[PDB]
């Protein structure tokens, strides 16, 4: 076996994974307004992945 | 193995579904009236030749000398030149479906005493009226120095 292989789910899962990163120190500074608690940032233990 | 091989439409159909019944339609029926009989075409071919030389004797100068000939093809023009009583001989094709298109003329012409010939096939009537299409009916309105052969 592969480790379920298909590129077409596999890439998009990897995109959401790259998309779930911290906000970049800068966008807090120039800035308009917010306690910038980003927020769409998701976790290995809790809630559940979607497509 | 060998011997025969021979003969599609007698034993291996389907191969054509529309037309077989179309032949059966011509041959069979039941049924009440109406269209049949004459042409041994000897007396077609003379009519056809004296229909070709009823478009094709056309001269007709600027001057009212004599314009010779008219032949007209197509059902409505043939009806109206019978009704307007100067058709000198009309021609009917037997090969007409809808039949309804040509039914009127044998009754109509015999009420005008205009003679009518019944050529077997529609395409030859269209070619010999010098169309580039078949013709269900045609007329001569005025022949051309032929009167004796026309009578």
């Amino acid at each position: 076996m592969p480790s379920h292989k298909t590129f077409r789910i596999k890439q998009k899962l990897a995109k959401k994974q790259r998309q779930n990163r911290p906000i970049p120190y800068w966008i807090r500074m120039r800035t308009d307004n917010t306690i910038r608690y980003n927020a769409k940032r998701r976790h290995w233990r809790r809630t559940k992945l979607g497509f | 193995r060998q011997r025969r091989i021979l003969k599609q439409r007698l034993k291996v159909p389907p191969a054509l579904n529309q037309f077989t019944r179309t032949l059966d339609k011509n041959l069979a029926t039941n049924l009440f009236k109406m269209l049949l009989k004459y042409r041994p075409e000897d007396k077609a071919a003379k009519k056809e030749r004296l229909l070709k030389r009823a478009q094709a004797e056309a001269e007709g100068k600027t001057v009212e000398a004599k314009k010779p000939i008219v032949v007209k093809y197509g059902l409505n023009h043939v009806t109206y030149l019978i009704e307007q009583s100067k058709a000198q001989l009309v021609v009917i094709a037997h090969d007409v479906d809808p039949i309804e298109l040509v039914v009127w003329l044998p009754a109509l012409c015999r009420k005008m005493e205009v003679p009518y010939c019944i050529v077997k096939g529609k395409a030859r009537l269209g070619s010999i009226v010098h169309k580039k299409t078949a013709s269900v009916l045609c007329l001569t309105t005025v022949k051309n120095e032929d009167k004796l052969e026309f009578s």
Partner: protein, 194 residues
């Protein structure tokens, strides 16, 4: 006038003389041929010549085959479920006519064309037969003819479906004008039930 009167006179009399023979014989064909038939000739040129027939490109004539009877209403053998003023399966008959269904079928299959008008080409004992005129919008010959370029206008696409055919006006009650006609004109949904 002309020759077109005789065939018109015949077609009155479906049951009689040459017309019952020749058209019962063309039903050997009509049963054989599909529920789309395009043909290159009108069966009735008279009622082509009086519903809009000019031979000219973009014109087609087509025969449609529609079942006889009413309408039968889903679901049988899992039946409604409701009080009996509203129970009905074969009892109801459509209040579109069988002529309009033929208009719909035809315009669905020839989707780039629009129904002009339609006529009657008989019945046997389960099929009712129509022949329908559909006229191209998109080609120059229809456009450069002022007797038939009114169809081209974008408002007139899919006109059979919105009931703007002659058949669609007639089942909509728009045959009268006056007295009576009062619930049909301008529309069966017209006042919004105020």
């Amino acid at each position: 006038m002309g020759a077109y009167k005789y065939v018109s006179e015949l077609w009155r009399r479906k049951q009689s003389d040459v017309m019952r023979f020749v058209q019962r014989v063309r039903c050997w064909e009509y049963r054989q041929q599909p529920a789309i038939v395009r043909l290159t000739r009108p069966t009735r040129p008279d009622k082509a010549r009086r519903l809009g027939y000019k031979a000219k490109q973009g014109y087609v004539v087509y025969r449609v085959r529609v079942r006889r009877g009413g309408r039968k209403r889903p679901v049988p053998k899992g039946i409604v479920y409701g009080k009996p003023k509203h129970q009905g399966i074969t009892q109801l008959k459509f209040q579109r006519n069988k002529r309009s269904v033929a208009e719909e079928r035809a315009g669905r299959k020839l989707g780039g064309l629009r129904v002009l008008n339609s006529y009657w080409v008989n019945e046997d004992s389960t099929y009712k037969y129509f022949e329908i005129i559909l006229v191209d919008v998109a080609h120059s010959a229809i456009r450069n003819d002022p007797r038939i370029n009114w169809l081209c206008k974008p408002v007139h696409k899919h006109r059979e479906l919105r009931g703007l055919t002659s058949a669609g006006k007639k089942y909509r009650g728009l045959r009268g004008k006056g007295h009576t006609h009062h619930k049909a004109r301008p529309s069966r949904r017209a006042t919004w039930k105020r």
